[PDB]
Hints:
Two copies of one chain form a homodimer.
Chain A: E1 4-8, H1 13-27, E2 32-37, H2 42-52, E3 60-64, H3 87-98, H4 101-111, E4 115-119, H5 125-130, E5 136-139, H6 144-156, E6 169-170, E7 179-180, H7 187-190, H8 195-210, E8 213-216, H9 224-231, E9 238-240, H10 251-257, E10 264-267, H11 277-290, E11 293-298, H12 307-310, E12 315-319, H13 324-329, E13 333-338, H14 342-351, E14 355-357, H15 364-374, E15 378-380, H16 398-410, H17 414-432, H18 437-450
Parallel strand pairs in A: 1-2, 1-4, 2-3, 4-5, 5-8, 8-9, 10-11, 10-13, 11-12, 13-14, 14-15
Antiparallel strand pairs in A: 6-7
PDB class: transferase
Keywords: glycosyltransferase, transferase, 15-crown-5
Assembly: dimeric
Amino acid sequence: QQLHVVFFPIMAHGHMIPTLDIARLFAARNVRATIITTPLNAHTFTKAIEMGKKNGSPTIHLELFKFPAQDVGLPEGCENLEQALGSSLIEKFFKGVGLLREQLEAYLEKTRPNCLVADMFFPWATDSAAKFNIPRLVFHGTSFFSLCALEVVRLYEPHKNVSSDEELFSLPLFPHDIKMMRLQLPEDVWKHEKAEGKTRLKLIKESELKSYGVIVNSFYELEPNYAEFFRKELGRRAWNIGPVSLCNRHECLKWLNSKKKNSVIYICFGSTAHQIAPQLYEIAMALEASGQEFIWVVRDSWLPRGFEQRVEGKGLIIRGWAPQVLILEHEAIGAFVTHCGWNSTLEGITAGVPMVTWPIFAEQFYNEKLVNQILKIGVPVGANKWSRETSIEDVIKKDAIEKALREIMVGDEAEERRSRAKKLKEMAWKAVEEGGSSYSDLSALIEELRGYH
Amino acid sequence: QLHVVFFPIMAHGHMIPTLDIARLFAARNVRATIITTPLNAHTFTKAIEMGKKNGSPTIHLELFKFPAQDVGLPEGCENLEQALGSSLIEKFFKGVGLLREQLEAYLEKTRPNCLVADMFFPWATDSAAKFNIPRLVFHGTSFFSLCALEVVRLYEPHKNVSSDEELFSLPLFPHDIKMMRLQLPEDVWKHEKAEGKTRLKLIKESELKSYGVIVNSFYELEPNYAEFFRKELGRRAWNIGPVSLCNRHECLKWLNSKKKNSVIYICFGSTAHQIAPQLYEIAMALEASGQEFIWVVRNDSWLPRGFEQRVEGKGLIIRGWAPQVLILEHEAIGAFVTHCGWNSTLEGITAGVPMVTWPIFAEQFYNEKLVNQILKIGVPVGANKWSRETSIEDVIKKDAIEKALREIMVGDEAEERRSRAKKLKEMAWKAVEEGGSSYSDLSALIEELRGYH
Ligand SMILES: C1COCCOCCOCCOCCO1
Ligand SMILES: [Br-]
Ligand SMILES: [Br-]
Ligand SMILES: [Br-]
Ligand SMILES: [Br-]
Ligand code: NA
């Protein structure tokens, strides 16, 4: 019999691409994979499918749902979490995605697949799959570490037993001592309690225990203690099947070919954040002052006066799309500046590149602790304020940036970080090849889905 | 009017407490329906009509056909008490699992606000969910047992021993509690049988998958395990017991002639299966001990000759029904010999009578640890072998029994056990009266069921 798994990601680029990669890993084991998307997001999937769909390359099916943008008052064409800018739109966007339930229940009634893999943001997907005795898996797109850290913070609230914004508290139970401050947690949890965000997080975490289990885009060997903590202490059924990006395995490259090994800083934040002019200026002055050679990807009043001229040949600025994977895997790259989103952290680990960690929002401050204090392949830029809005007060200055750029390239422990990063790269590829922890966990998941009655 | 359906397994120890819970719901103006089978209906009918006429609200019964023939049981075998021997218990569980069709049909028809389903129906969660009905789990046991089973299942302390009698501590517990493999069921520790191990797995997983757990305990009795169950093991729970207390001749006249705390009550229940060689050893122990006793035996090769004559002053035997509650509450009773089933333990705590603990099966060896090592209101008879079958080889001898009867009446700690038992009695009645922990928790549960959306 052929097994059928439906994939239901939230319309955000950082959930969608890893969800596609999971679909491909299932397809490559002779499982029918269907992804549910919306019409204004379909182009993203259909590009990657035709790109990936060469010789071999088993078939990935698409099902399109109508997103009720107008029904909840979203400006028409807002079908993506990236377009929900401001306090106002994010709350309408979630009421938006919650009204996809009717369509999901209809599609599952009709197709009766063997399993639903639904985004963390659809906690109600468990109840929906259950109506047809279909097992539902949760996919978050983050580290075991973050999944554990959020859950012990939610349950033990260690931040209610401090008095000031900067007072450090330990994460309880953890097999490593991890200190955070309130500034690093979202302002709803600690300052002015908003029921909406707090309920939303409650139902997401409760869904990890309510559902059949969790798919995790990590490998056992990367964070063995949190892969265990998540399953034992916090009692989740889980599989680690990542890094899922390794499934299907330029002008700046020619530039890089001319340079010494481990000599270039790559800076790329992604389309996650909006980079404001004053922040870009301070980054520009830091790069010049540091002396380090650099490739800087930006998504002209914000460049210092002589900048383009004075860095000609020690520095490259790219506007828009860079071939990120190829640039990170190049021998010339010695470091990677990032916001510590899990997709970006994984591409650093996989390329074996140490990281300057610039956490902004979501789970990024926990990812920064994994990278800097446990894996020890990174250096903090000094950003410590959780925020989905970008205020002038939170702009990180030249001196802080410059200190991190120097430390990640020519600091005492720079070479050590580089070696630790090279080990994790070798472990990552080994996990996903036959006999690997992540290959095996995927085999065990599929077997268990076959046997489910 | 709010409507709650109660779906207990056909075992006298689940059924009676389930009726008492239904009465507590009725007394707060909730429509209570209990699902039973036709050969079990008489048990509920008796307790209803005896308790009713007193004006107390009506409890409805719904009968399901038990598929005895479909799974190869006798047509007369509608009760876990008739499934005697290795073979029949397995058919009995296949039996009760085929009640799903009828439960789904009845819930579709009647649309109640909540399903309270026995621990043994883990599938009842998905069945209730099909009609967006919350499902509560009811076990009939202590917080201690619920915690102990779950810590033993997850942290497997028994893999690290080498012999059947080697003591291991229960992990994470705030008490040091030492058990041996002999005290655990033979499937979990010796020859791993998928059936009993899968069944236990799905029961424990249902505590987290369902809306929450009703617990027939009071907070004050085991405050540490009431907390551990909710926090460490992350269950939503209400403690509403002892549910026994909601409601509230020849042997009494006999007892009136005796000293305070001078009589041992022995009653295993009419549940219990006592073989003749076991009863003989109990008889010789009672004589040799010199202690006064009332001994209730289930409805004569097992009595020594002239037994009834030689004990005419000191000792009374009752065949069949005894007014158990009235006998245990009488001033003359100084001890209670019982099997450490939670219903029995609760009638000891509630009468304020210390116990000789005779664990046989289910959760009883964990209950025995609570009573002897944490509440310290009991003395073990020295049964340490978990078994659903009663073999002549495992019979507990006169010498062991006689030692426990002496120990519970005139041993070192006898008076202290008596005092500790009297404190727990006072706390038990306080818990279920208005303002009590158990009255409150029931009010909060009902409120939360009203507000369910
Ligand atoms: C099962 C799952 O319980 C989830 C809550 O966990 C909160 C803290 O863990 C403490 C360790 O308990 C062990 C088993 O845990
Ligand atoms: Br680790
Ligand atoms: Br850090
Ligand atoms: Br306790
Ligand atoms: Br004991
Ligand atoms: Na736990």
